[PDB]
Every structure is written in structure tokens, then in C-alpha cells.
């Protein structure tokens, strides 16, 4: 159940004339392609982005996408003309297409459409259909779009056959990048809490890859259950950043440590004690005026 391949399309329609479509492609949490509106061709963001496909096979798909992008734009504009009072610019459409890969040549495909930020339409089997909660007026556009047997046939091709095949090539060719292990670097800080005489201890953890990580404030072998893990934040070099906070009363700091478990570390956890020789020296280099 290892990997999700995602083609993400972002289409903005301001008015009857102005429009742009930009796309990005992801395998897991690594970016493989980008497609700007002003770019005629799909760009590779990795050396292995073409997968196992030949130059002829790639050019064939690229040509198909070029026709589609232009065709999508006008089709939406026509639907607005058709839908009239119901809908009207500005229009924001997000499209998420791809497949989830599994061990043993097993695959599931998907094509999801969001309208004005809300998930409204999916391609299922042989045709478009509304999802629960979708506005009732979508019934007509879906009927109209489902009358296009040609578009449907190519969608089915890309979903049933082209995704699973292409992704498998991507998984093989990008093996070294997908299986990379980058070591986390941890450092400590603190700020005053809203409560008087209380402090919030912050354990910063940066530069780790892959994403799964374990961070807890500790007093000896005792996990501090007041530890609040933050959100995973991306770094520019395709690594992750995370911080865990803990609320203590002034004086409680001594004896506490931030512990970090990560696959790149082996079995050798990073243990960072609050009062440490290194923390003291690193804090000296961190001083500022606020």
C-alpha cells in the first residue's frame, strides 16, 4: 500500500476571458513534474521523471495533455454559458488524478474534481458522477459530459492502464531517491506561556526524511503526555520539519529531554537534555533582541 501518485490540476477562471491552468505531479511526497500555464511542455523536476517510458511514448502523452488543457479551458467556459444564472465567475477548479500502488501488481485508480474548494465530481468506472453533498444543478453538466464517449474512453485508458504502468516505471527508476534516508537535526528553545510563571519548551526537529518520525519530551523513561506535536512542515530541499512543545512551570526544565526516533538514525535515538553542555552553547549563538 506503499505509494500514491497524484496529478494535480489547478484551474482559475476570473471572467469570460481570463483563465489559467497550472499542474504539479507528486509521487508520495516527492515532486516529479510541473506544468505552468505559459509553458507549452511538461517539465521534469527529477532526472527519473520520464519513468521507463520511451521518448515516443512520452511525446504521445504530452501531446494528448496539450490538446486536453486547451480543450478543458473552453469546455468550462461553455458550461458557464450553459449554466448561466446557476453558476458564474469567478470559478476555481481543482483536479486530482492518479493511482495508489500496492505490492503484488495491485492498483487502485482515482480521478477527483473539486469545484470552489469542495469535492463534487468523480470519474467512476465508465462515467462521471456526482458525490454526496454535490449541488443538484451538476446533474445536467454531468449528463452533457457523459455523452462524450471519446473523452470517457481516454480517461478509462489513462486510469485503468496508463497510471499503473507508468507509476511502476517511476518506482523502479526513482528507487534511490524514494528510499533516501536523511538524518534529523534537533535543537531546543523556550518562550513564556500565557500563564504567569509558566514556560513553553520547544524541541525543533529539521531535515529528516522520510516523514515518519517520533518526538517526545521526556523525564527519564517517563513520556510527558503534555507534549504537543505540531504539523509537518516542508523544507526546500525535500526534507521535513517538526516541533514538539511542552508547557512547564519555571524550574521544571531541569531533568527534561527531547527524544527523537527516526529510521535514518538506526536504533540510535537523538536525546537532547534541557540543561546540556550543547544547549547552553547553542543558546548563546541564538541570542537576539526580540
Amino acid at each position, epitope marked *: 500500500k506503499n505509494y500514491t501518485f497524484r496529478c494535480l490540476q489547478m484551474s482559475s477562471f476570473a471572467n469570460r476571458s481570463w483563465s489559467r491552468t497550472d499542474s504539479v505531479v507528486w509521487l508520495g511526497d516527492l515532486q516529479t513534474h510541473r506544468w505552468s500555464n505559459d509553458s507549452a511542455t511538461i517539465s521534469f523536476t527529477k532526472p527519473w521523471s520520464q519513468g521507463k517510458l520511451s521518448n515516443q511514448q512520452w511525446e504521445k502523452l504530452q501531446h494528448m495533455f496539450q*490538446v486536453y488543457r486547451v*480543450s478543458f479551458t*473552453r*469546455d468550462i467556459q*461553455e*458550461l458557464v*454559458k*450553459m449554466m*448561466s444564472p446557476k453558476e458564474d465567475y469567478p470559478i476555481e477548479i481543482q483536479l486530482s488524478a492518479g493511482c495508489e500502488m500496492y505490492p503484488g501488481n495491485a492498483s487502485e485508480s482515482f480521478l477527483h474534481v473539486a469545484f470552489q474548494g469542495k469535492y463534487v465530481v468523480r470519474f467512476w468506472g465508465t462515467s462521471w458522477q456526482t458525490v454526496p453533498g454535490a449541488p443538484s444543478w451538476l446533474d445536467l453538466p454531468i*449528463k*452533457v*459530459l457523459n*455523452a*462524450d*464517449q*471519446g*473523452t470517457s474512453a481516454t480517461v478509462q485508458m489513462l486510469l485503468n492502464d496508463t497510471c499503473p504502468l507508468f507509476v511502476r516505471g517511476l518506482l523502479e527508476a526513482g528507487k534511490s531517491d524514494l528510499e533516501k534516508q536523511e538524518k534529523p537535526v534537533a535543537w531546543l528553545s523556550s518562550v513564556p506561556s500565557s500563564a504567569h510563571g509558566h514556560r513553553q519548551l520547544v524541541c525543533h526537529v529539521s531535515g529528516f526524511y522520510p516523514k515518519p518520525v517520533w518526538v517526545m519530551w521526556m523525564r527519564g523513561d517517563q513520556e510527558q503526555q503534555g507534549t504537543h506535536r505540531g504539523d509537518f512542515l516542508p523544507n526546500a530541499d525535500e526534507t521535513w520539519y517538526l516541533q514538539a512543545t511542552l508547557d512547564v512551570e519555571a524550574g521544571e526544565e531541569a531533568g527534561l529531554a527531547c527524544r527523537v526516533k527516526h529510521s535514518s538514525l538506526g536504533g540510535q535515538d537523538i536525546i537532547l537534555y534541557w540543561g546540556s553542555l550543547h544547549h547552553i552553547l547553542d543558546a548563546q549563538k541564538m541570542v537576539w533582541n526580540h
Partner: T-cell receptor, first 114, second 113 residues
């Protein structure tokens, strides 16, 4: 199982006069079209409609206006008839759920007199 | 402009076979169809072609479509005097009613007895 009829079949125009062409259809078609046929060129879309009162500009909308009063009826107006203008106008209707189903009217021949 | 028909004018002896050509560059090319227009009249549907390599027939009319070559030929078998008309090739750019039709200038067929 029906007809699409344009009226009038022939139209006498005068320089600067406003002209009105009517097209009626009982195919139960939501989409209706107004084309212009010039010699040696090929049909060119003036206006089209998804229903009343949808009026959408085609590539040759300038100098014309259109109105869809109801589903069966789609009118085209010539805003200002040109001096020596001889023209042929063709109405068509199509099914919204079948792009291959399109029927055309018999045409309207316009001659603008001095 | 995007739909080109040749020849401009075809003269065929009665009883003989006529061949009419259409070349296009419209994309996508979902379907191509042929229309007959009598003088002082409208367009009458002859045949609709849909597949990558397609053959259709309708009475004495038959047509072929090659999408890779972007080329279509209309055939008229055993030409009668009533075949005298303009023949128009038309390409539709979508498989849905959101599409537009692209009209050829037409081929005048003249059938001499």
C-alpha cells in the same frame, strides 16, 4: 420527427434598415444556431443559444443581435443592413445530449436594394 | 480555413462514380460528417464518421475517415442528375454539445447527362 423552419424564405432589405429572421423548431432541442453562408467561404457561426434567454456570440456576431424567447424559437436581427449586401442565413438546432444530432433550416436569402 | 475540400468543382459523367476529398487540421477531431446542399436550400445529412479508421454508407453515398492522415473521402456510386449540388465536409471538435462545428467551403458537383 419534426421540422426546423426559417421565416422568411426571401427578404428584401434596405440600406441601414433593421431586419429580423425567425427560426422555429419542434425537435425539443435546447441548442440553436445562426450561421451565415458566404460564397466560397463555408458556414460561419453568428450566434447560438442554450435556451431562453441565452444568447452567445459566435465568430461573426458583430453587426447582429439575437434573442431566444422560448425553447422552440430563436430570432436573429440584422442591426444595420449593408449597401450592396446579398446574404444567405442558415438556422440549425441540436440535441444537448447528442452532438451528432443537428438539423438545418432551408435558409433565408437576403437582397438589399438601393 | 481549418477544413479544406478538393476539388472546388467536380464534373462527372452520369452513371460514373464521384470522389470528393476533405482535409482538416482541427483538434480534437472527434467526428467528421458530410452534408448535401441543393441550390437555394439547406444542409441535408449524408453520413457521420466517428472512429480512427471509419467507413460508413447511406444509399448511394459512402465515406471513409482516416484520422491519422486527417483525411476523408466521400464516394457517390452511380451518379444521377439529382446529385448536382454542393457537398460540405464538417468536423466537430467535441463528443459533447459543448463543441463547435468547423465547416468546409464545399465542392460543387456537376453531373452531365
Amino acid at each position: 420527427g419534426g421540422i426546423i423552419t426559417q421565416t422568411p424564405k426571401f427578404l428584401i432589405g434596405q440600406e441601414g434598415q433593421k431586419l429580423t429572421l425567425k427560426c422555429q423548431q419542434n425537435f425539443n432541442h435546447d441548442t440553436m444556431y445562426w450561421y451565415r453562408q458566404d460564397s466560397g467561404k463555408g458556414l460561419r457561426l453568428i450566434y447560438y443559444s442554450y435556451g431562453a434567454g441565452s444568447t452567445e456570440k459566435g465568430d461573426l456576431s458583430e453587426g447582429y443581435d439575437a434573442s431566444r424567447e422560448k425553447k422552440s424559437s430563436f430570432s436573429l436581427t440584422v442591426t444595420s443592413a449593408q449597401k450592396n449586401e446579398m446574404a444567405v442565413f442558415l438556422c440549425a438546432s441540436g440535441s444537448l445530449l447528442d452532438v451528432r444530432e443537428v438539423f438545418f433550416g432551408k435558409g433565408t436569402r437576403l437582397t438589399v436594394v438601393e | 480555413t481549418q477544413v479544406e475540400q478538393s476539388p472546388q468543382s467536380l464534373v462527372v459523367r452520369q452513371g460514373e462514380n464521384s470522389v470528393l476529398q476533405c482535409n482538416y487540421s482541427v483538434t480534437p477531431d472527434n467526428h467528421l460528417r458530410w452534408f448535401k446542399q441543393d441550390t437555394g436550400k439547406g444542409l441535408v445529412s449524408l453520413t457521420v464518421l466517428v472512429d480512427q479508421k471509419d467507413k460508413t454508407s447511406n444509399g448511394r453515398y459512402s465515406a471513409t475517415l482516416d484520422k491519422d492522415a486527417k483525411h476523408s473521402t466521400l464516394h457517390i456510386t452511380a451518379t444521377l442528375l439529382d446529385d448536382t449540388a454542393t457537398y460540405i465536409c464538417v468536423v466537430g471538435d467535441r463528443g459533447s454539445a459543448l463543441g463547435r462545428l468547423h465547416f468546409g467551403a464545399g465542392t460543387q458537383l456537376i453531373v452531365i447527362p
